[PDB]
Amino acid sequence: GVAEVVETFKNPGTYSSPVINFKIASPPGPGTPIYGPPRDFSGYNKSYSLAIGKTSYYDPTTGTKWNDDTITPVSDGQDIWRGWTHTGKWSFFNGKAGDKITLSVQRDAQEASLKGAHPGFILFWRPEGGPLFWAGTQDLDEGQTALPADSDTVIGHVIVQHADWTLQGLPPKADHTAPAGVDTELYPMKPDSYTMYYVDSGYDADKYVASKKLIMHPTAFKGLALNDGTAGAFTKSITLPKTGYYMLYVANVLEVDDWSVDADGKLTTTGEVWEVPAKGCWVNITISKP
Ligand SMILES: [Ca+2]
Ligand SMILES: [Cu+2]
Ligand SMILES: [Hg+2]
Numbered sequence: 001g002v003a004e005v006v007e008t009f010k011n012p013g014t015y016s017s018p019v020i021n022f023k024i025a026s027p028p029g030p031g032t033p034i035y036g037p038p039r040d041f042s043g044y045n046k047s048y049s050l051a052i053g054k055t056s057y058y059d060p061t062t063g064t065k066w067n068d069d070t071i072t073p074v075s076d077g078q079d080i081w082r083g084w085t086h087t088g089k090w091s092f093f094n095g096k097a098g099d100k101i102t103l104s105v106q107r108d109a110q111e112a113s114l115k116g117a118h119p120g121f122i123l124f125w126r127p128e129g130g131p132l133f134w135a136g137t138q139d140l141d142e143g144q145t146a147l148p149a150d151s152d153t154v155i156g157h158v159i160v161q162h163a164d165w166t167l168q169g170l171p172p173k174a175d176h177t178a179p180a181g182v183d184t185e186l187y188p189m190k191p192d193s194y195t196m197y198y199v200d201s202g203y204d205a206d207k208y209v210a211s212k213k214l215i216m217h218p219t220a221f222k223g224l225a226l227n228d229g230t231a232g233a234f235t236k237s238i239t240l241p242k243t244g245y246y247m248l249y250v251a252n253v254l255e256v257d258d259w260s261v262d263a264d265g266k267l268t269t270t271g272e273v274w275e276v277p278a279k280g281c282w283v284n285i286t287i288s289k290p
Pocket of ligand 2: 018084085086087156157158
């Protein structure tokens with residue numbers, strides 16, 4: 001591994017390369033929007049707070065699973081539920097090859113004792129070096145010549161958490177470029193495709209109640225479990241493999257007594273750990289150096 005998941009563009013569609021926003025902080029509602037500052041962690045020792053949806057990270061409500069064909073036995077890599085792109089929250093940073101940093105997500109100071117959050121993340125590298133405008137994708141098909149402020153494209157509405165992610169069949173694009181340094185044999189710049197290269201991912205595996213279980217796959221994400229004895233938080237050391245622009249996705253794993261997905265793919269749970277206030281589930285992402 002890692003697996004590579006290859007999507008086929010379709011607009012309207014799940015894999016329509018929709019735009020994400022780096023300020024939106026309010027929970028999966030509307031609800032009435034809350035926007036904060038853009039979550040740029042460039043320079044590091046930055047920290048931002050925002051709300052994450054109940055099952056966003058490993059999300060049966062997506063009705064979508066993928067499978068990871070790089071796991072032996074392949075049985076162990078199947079029916080991996082996707083995360084939701086838009087009930088997670090997106091951030092970015094610019095950085096340098098070899099940069100040694102530490103990512104921490106934990107319950108927000110003001111929710112410090114409410115049980116619920118089991119944050120996880122995915123970190124991607126975008127060899128294009130910056131936000132990617134692509135005309136004819138979902139939210140850029142109305143004559144736009146640029147991305148809206150504080151926004152960027154991602155492949156689709158339901159995301160893979162342990163794979164390189166490729167979109168193919170895009171409206172032909174003559175200016176799909178990378179900067180001078182990028183090895184375009186390893187990281188090709190296609191007229192009709194782009195890839196989000198996997199960097200790292202993990203989630204908080206510490207339960208609030210040892211008898212309970214996480215809405216999480218039995219085996220496929222074994223390498224991604226993060227255990228530190230503290231429910232509601234994880235920390236992770238990350239060395240940046242490349243110079244340039246990184247895209248960070250953070251979302252939530254839900255703890256339950258039991259859960260089930262019925263024939264019509266409806267999600268049911270019992271005994272949810274979810275003591276979450278009117279304002280929603282708030283976490284704080286900090287990237288520090290070191
Ligand atoms: Ca933990
Ligand atoms: Cu979405
Ligand atoms: Hg919560």
